[PDB]
Write a protein that binds this ligand. Sequence first.
Ligand code: FHG
Ligand code: CL
Ligand code: CL
Ligand code: CL
Ligand code: CL
Ligand code: CL
Ligand code: MG
Ligand code: NA
Ligand code: NA
Ligand code: NA
Length: 326
Amino acid sequence: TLNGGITDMLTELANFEKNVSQAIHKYNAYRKAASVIAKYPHKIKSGAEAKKLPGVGTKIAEKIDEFLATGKLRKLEKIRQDDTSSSINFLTRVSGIGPSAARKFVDEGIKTLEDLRKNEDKLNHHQRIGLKYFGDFEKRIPREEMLQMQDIVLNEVKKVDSEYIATVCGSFRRGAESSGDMDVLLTHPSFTSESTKQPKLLHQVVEQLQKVHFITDTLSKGETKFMGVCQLPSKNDEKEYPHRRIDIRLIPKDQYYCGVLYFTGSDIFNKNMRAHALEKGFTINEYTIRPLGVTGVAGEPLPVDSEKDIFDYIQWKYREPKDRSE
DNA sequence: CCGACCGCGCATCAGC
DNA sequence: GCTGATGCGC
DNA sequence: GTCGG
Ligand SMILES: Nc1nc2c(ncn2[C@H]2C[C@H](O)[C@@H](COP(=O)(O)OP(=O)(O)[C@@H](F)P(=O)(O)O)O2)c(=O)[nH]1
Ligand SMILES: [Cl-]
Ligand SMILES: [Cl-]
Ligand SMILES: [Cl-]
Ligand SMILES: [Cl-]
Ligand SMILES: [Cl-]
Ligand SMILES: [Mg+2]
Ligand code: NA
Ligand code: NA
Ligand code: NA
């Protein structure tokens, strides 16, 4: 919040570029500036001061000078007044509606929540559940509720098979006092990089959580990734908890550290870390870190016995999860 | 300059 | 049906 | 939009 004015401006510009211009690289450029500035431990006094930071260049520097002098940005003022952009930006807030679908909807004269509700027939399944819980998915989850959700998910998984390990990642693992959703990393000994010795490993867990009415809707579901919706049980006479987004990723057990590194994020931290890896001659995904040969082709998986080994390979000092919130 | 910008699972589609 | 490309989201 | 080579 020290430079919250500026970082908000940049995020709004990032959202415009992604959602309206469908200019993903511009979007990442703005997100990176916002992130580098959000970290900066001083109140920024000028564009020039900002430009010293990596990811802030001439254009962003100029915008920061405008914002500092006036408290706003004319380019944004105009975007906000523009009915087509505003409509498109709005629709992309429904889970399952991206920039392409949002613009297709807007072309058909579907531009508001009212329009979406009356055209459910035009929605795929994901989009439909996104609209259903539109309000709910806007709400943050207090850590206290995440703690109760953890407890249900770990206990239910334990009931299915005591050899499962379920680990809550995302901003929760980074120590955040609230989270946008719940991310669960799942492992079982019978699923490794070498073999899948049991089928339905994810499904059974999903089933048990549906059984006890924790998981209420499914956005998508494959052998290793579940994306859907869950809700804490509420007591007699009390209002229901909001429904919440839940993702569950089943990862080969021998690839736990790469998987927990990935699912811990943040997303920007993952991008930055993977890009540094490339500079160091490695590539990192949620499974492995592999060397790039002279060609630039991934070699074989390097050995990894902790998250710190991954940091070590790319010559970064270890960062605890709570310092990875970029 | 100017190329590169992280890496991937699932749903949905086109084209065979 | 298949594979490959694209959208979307993590 | 920003950056490194
Ligand atoms: N490589 C890579 N990894 C990505 C990306 N997006 C998400 N991830 C990873 C890290 C994130 O913590 C994790 C969960 O993705 P989330 O979108 O849940 O992110 P979180 O850190 O939990 C917070 F945004 P919150 O949910 O609290 O509001 O998934 C991406 O674009 N690239
Ligand atoms: Cl772009
Ligand atoms: Cl503004
Ligand atoms: Cl690993
Ligand atoms: Cl891999
Ligand atoms: Cl931590
Ligand atoms: Mg999350
Ligand atoms: Na800079
Ligand atoms: Na969306
Ligand atoms: Na998530």
